[PDB]
Amino acid sequence: QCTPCAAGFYANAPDSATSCRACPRGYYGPYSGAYADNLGDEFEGPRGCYKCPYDFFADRPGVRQCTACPPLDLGGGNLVEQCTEDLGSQRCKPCSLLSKPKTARTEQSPPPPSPSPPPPPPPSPRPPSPNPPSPRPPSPAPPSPN
Amino acid sequence: PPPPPPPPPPPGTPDQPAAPAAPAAPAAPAAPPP
């Protein structure tokens, strides 16, 4: 039997995979059963380990979801938000000091998640039950007298 | 004579390989000014 690759892992083939592998540091796999076709990015698939969004970051290889940059606290009352320079990164840098800003990020944001599959049907109705033994016939009367 | 019994299931399948830790936290604290 075949086993589906767990969350945070992807199969290294579209059809006949030999071993699931962990998603890279900059990516994340939300689903169960991720597979990596070879058409475009190597570690990317329709359900595969997606790269973390612009704001969000993750560093652990096999992870379900990324996390947002934490608010940097340099001392008293200094909560400065942080962002990422590139599309997928495992380190979140200050948003003030990044070179390419939110202004120049020309990537277009990917579609929403396609809907969730229907449920399993009920158990089918068993075929009918066997009719009982049919009845017997009449019995031969005793020989008429002579 | 009646039929024989069924088999027992397989065990519990293996667990995914435990992930590694994280980076070594930072690099250069503060390079000297000019």
Ligand SMILES: *[C@@H]1O[C@H](CO)[C@H](O)[C@H](O)[C@H]1O
């Ligand atoms: C009638 O037959 C079915 C089998 O389809 C089932 O055994 C029932 O228990 C029986 O009453």
Ligand SMILES: *[C@H]1O[C@H](CO)[C@H](O)[C@H](O)[C@H]1O
């Ligand atoms: C799509 O929209 C997001 C905001 O959620 C962001 O601007 C990305 O740069 C874009 O790809």
Ligand SMILES: *[C@H]1O[C@H](CO)[C@H](O)[C@H](O)[C@H]1O
């Ligand atoms: C499934 O639906 C979503 C939108 O809901 C998206 O278009 C995907 O590309 C599609 O596969």
Ligand SMILES: *[C@H]1O[C@H](CO)[C@H](O)[C@H](O)[C@H]1O
């Ligand atoms: C079932 O599937 C969709 C993705 O196709 C989504 O994860 C839903 O949250 C889930 O219920």
Ligand SMILES: *[C@H]1O[C@H](CO)[C@H](O)[C@H](O)[C@H]1O
């Ligand atoms: C029992 O259930 C299945 C569901 O797949 C089928 O539709 C019929 O309802 C019956 O065979």
Ligand SMILES: *[C@H]1O[C@H](CO)[C@H](O)[C@H](O)[C@H]1O
């Ligand atoms: C005669 O009637 C039926 C058959 O015709 C059955 O065998 C009885 O046992 C017998 O008496």
Ligand SMILES: *[C@H]1O[C@H](CO)[C@H](O)[C@H](O)[C@H]1O
């Ligand atoms: C003797 O018995 C048989 C049974 O069918 C028949 O009635 C004759 O008429 C009787 O004499």
